[PDB]
């Protein structure tokens, strides 16, 4: 436990309130704008694991419900009231932006298709120009070797993905507490060999902060190349559709998925009869919009049929995996 001072750094809420952990009060507190510039912001983004990335940083009114105001190189000056009455909020990467049947170009720029032996197998989401979030059950033995996998981005049709024109995968990381029987902690990370070039067709999606204040039945979206029938062929074109969150206690009741949903899971879809919500495939994105930013909520894990009553979709809960991802991105 060689902890020089204590803990690390995070962002809070849908406005990216910069918060730090104090070893003396044992709690999280925001940072005052007083004596803050851009060079200090790059020290915070590198700390979480974003490396050379940096986007913006300003001061706003605090809404994190905090009272007391203000690791390595810890400028610890605690107080109780900020001067100029401003807390600093910074963004480390430009994400959560998109355009404004079939999906249009630029509508879901973070979606990718992952191939093995020149055929689509799973899907994933882009967070940084080198990192991709997918599902752990896509990479069981023998598909743990990173050489099997290639990625395609910015392309909507399968017939347009030609052998040898996909980005090579450098390494894959499953979650250390995965279990194939129960599908608990079904999440995995993939790292590319050369970074992508962002544009109007390829952009990343923001990871979720704490204190999102999501509604009981929040409106969300899914996308992918999945079939309309559970045994059908992969779709040639990319599709998307709307879904609603379903509270865990309801999803865990006797008449749905009796005692099968864990704290690392989340349900979304419809409990009624004939609504086609099978557009996505394994590891695909589940996103929602709030404060004009798109956030990654889950990766598709398992289900039971297509457009069947009582049987929604189950996803990996990204919010509870944010720390593990920040640690893997930091250990370059």
């Amino acid at each position: 436990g060689g902890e020089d001072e204590n803990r690390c750094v995070r962002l809070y809420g849908p406005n990216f309130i910069l918060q730090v952990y104090s070893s003396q009060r044992k709690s999280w507190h925001p940072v005052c704008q007083d004596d803050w510039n851009e060079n200090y912001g790059r020290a915070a983004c590198r700390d979480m694991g974003y490396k050379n990335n940096f986007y913006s940083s300003q001061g706003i009114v605090d809404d994190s419900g905090s009272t007391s105001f203000m690791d390595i190189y810890k400028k610890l000056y605690h107080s109780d009231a900020c001067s100029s009455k401003a807390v600093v909020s910074l963004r480390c990467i430009a994400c959560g932006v998109n355009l404004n049947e079939s999906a249009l170009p630029g509508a879901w720029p973070w979606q990718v298709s992952l191939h093995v032996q020149n055929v689509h197998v799973c899907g994933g989401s882009i967070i940084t120009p080198e990192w991709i979030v997918t599902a752990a059950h896509c990479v069981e033995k023998p598909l743990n070797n990173p050489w099997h996998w290639t990625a395609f981005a910015g392309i909507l049709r399968q017939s347009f993905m030609f052998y040898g024109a996909g980005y090579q995968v450098e390494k894959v990381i499953s979650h250390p507490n995965y279990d194939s029987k129960t599908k608990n902690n079904d999440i995995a990370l993939m790292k590319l060999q050369k970074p992508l070039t962002f544009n109007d067709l390829v952009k990343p999606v923001c990871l979720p902060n704490p204190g999102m204040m999501l509604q009981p039945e929040q409106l969300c979206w899914i996308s992918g190349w999945g079939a309309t029938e559970e045994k059908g062929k992969t779709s040639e074109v990319l599709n998307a559709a709307k879904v609603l969150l379903i509270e865990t206690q309801r999803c865990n009741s006797r008449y749905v998925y009796d005692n099968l949903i864990t704290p690392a899971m989340i349900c979304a879809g419809f409990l009624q009869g004939n609504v086609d919500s099978c557009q996505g495939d394994s590891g695909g994105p589940l996103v929602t919009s709030k404060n004009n930013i798109w956030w990654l909520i889950g990766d598709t894990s398992w289900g039971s049929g297509c457009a069947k009553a009582y049987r929604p979709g189950v996803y990996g809960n990204v919010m509870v995996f944010t720390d593990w991802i920040y640690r893997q991105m930091r250990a370059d």
């Binding site: 006797r254 009869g273 049929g305 009553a309 049987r311």
Partner: protein, 364 residues
């Protein structure tokens, strides 16, 4: 707006309607089983009726109560039931509460009057009864409540005649988990629709219809019990039933499909007593103003003169028409009854009872 005929004669020695005696009956029904009675060919006194029953309020819609006194009607229709104390506001015209949605809907297009009254509490005995035949067919028996509790429905559901709420024993026995209760359905009915599914490593996970219950159903389009509001003149179609409580687990063909009493949902009750009296509601419907032989005795009748040698319209002892009148001596009136008929031409003469004079009747 139909005018009274120029000459008019009522039928003597008709019996009294005795409307107060029916409204004051001590076996008072609840709104779930509201009762109806039709009055015609009798005499009634509105001022005396409004007093013999202890009236708190009396008002009419599309009609003025002053227009009732002294008039005749073709028939008068009355519906009645007791009022749960907490639901009295449901009876306002146009309200969408529980009483008019699932028990008794007040017709607003006809000429009607609403009457609120009460009875002494110690004499009243409430009669609660379920009118739904499909509820009774599958195990609903009676209520067990206090002598002043008044049942009312909250939701009503309807089904075809082929309905049965139990699962098939052939299906249920092959379920590996989440097995539904099963029994045999009557001949002519169809079995509850069920399905066997798989998820993760589980197989034969059975799922049936109307889950959790028909009021909160996740998938109403595939549940046989359908929500429905009561129309004018109808009663509630029936309480919804929890199909997961119909039949028995591992039940075979020596058990007939019946539902337990806690399976019938969507109803409640409340007392009608306040200040030692139980409150009651009644609805009047007035059919055929200025016609028929259901007449009021509230005003003295005018002895209109039988106009002779003129083309006149008449309403004589319930029969209407148009013709000319000519008085004749008794030798030429060939009958003893108050109306004189042709073999098929109907009225050809009549005898006035208030003056014993006799007349012939010709066409205009």
């Amino acid at each position: 707006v139909k005018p009274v005929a120029t000459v008019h004669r009522r039928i003597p020695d008709l019996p009294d309607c005795d409307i107060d005696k029916w409204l004051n009956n001590f076996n008072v029904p609840s709104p779930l089983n509201w009762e109806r009675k039709i009055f015609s060919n009798c005499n009634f006194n509105l001022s005396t009726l409004l007093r013999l029953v202890h009236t708190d309020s009396f008002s009419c819609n599309n009609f003025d109560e002053s227009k009732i006194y002294g008039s005749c009607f073709k028939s008068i229709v009355l519906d009645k039931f007791a009022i749960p104390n907490s639901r009295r506001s449901d009876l306002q015209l146009g309200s969408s509460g529980f009483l008019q949605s699932s028990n008794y809907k007040i017709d607003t297009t006809s000429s009607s009057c609403q009457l609120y009254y009460s009875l002494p509490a110690i004499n009243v005995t409430i009669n609660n009864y379920n009118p739904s035949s499909w509820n009774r067919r599958y195990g609903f028996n009676n209520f067990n409540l206090s002598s002043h509790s008044v049942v009312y429905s909250r939701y009503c559901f309807s089904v075809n005649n082929t309905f049965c709420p139990c699962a098939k024993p052939s299906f249920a026995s092959s379920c590996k988990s989440h097995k539904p209760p099963s029994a045999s359905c009557p001949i002519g009915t169809n079995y509850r629709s069920c399905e066997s599914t798989t998820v993760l490593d589980h197989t034969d996970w059975c799922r049936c219809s109307c889950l959790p219950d028909p009021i909160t159903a996740y998938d109403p389009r595939s549940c046989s019990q359908k929500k429905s509001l009561v129309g004018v003149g109808e009663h509630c179609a029936g309480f919804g039933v929890d199909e997961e409580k119909c039949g028995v687990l591992d039940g075979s063909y020596n058990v007939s499909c019946l539902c337990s009493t806690d399976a019938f949902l969507g109803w409640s009750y409340d007392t009608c007593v306040s200040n030692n009296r139980c409150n009651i509601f009644s609805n009047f419907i007035l059919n055929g103003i200025n016609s028929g032989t259901t007449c009021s005795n509230d005003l003295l009748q005018p002895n209109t003169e039988v106009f002779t040698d003129v083309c006149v319209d008449y309403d004589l002892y319930g029969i209407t028409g148009q013709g000319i009148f000519k008085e004749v001596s008794a030798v030429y009136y060939n009958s003893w009854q108050n109306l004189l008929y042709d073999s098929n031409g109907n009225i050809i003469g009549f005898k006035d009872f208030v003056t014993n004079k006799t007349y012939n009747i010709f066409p205009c």
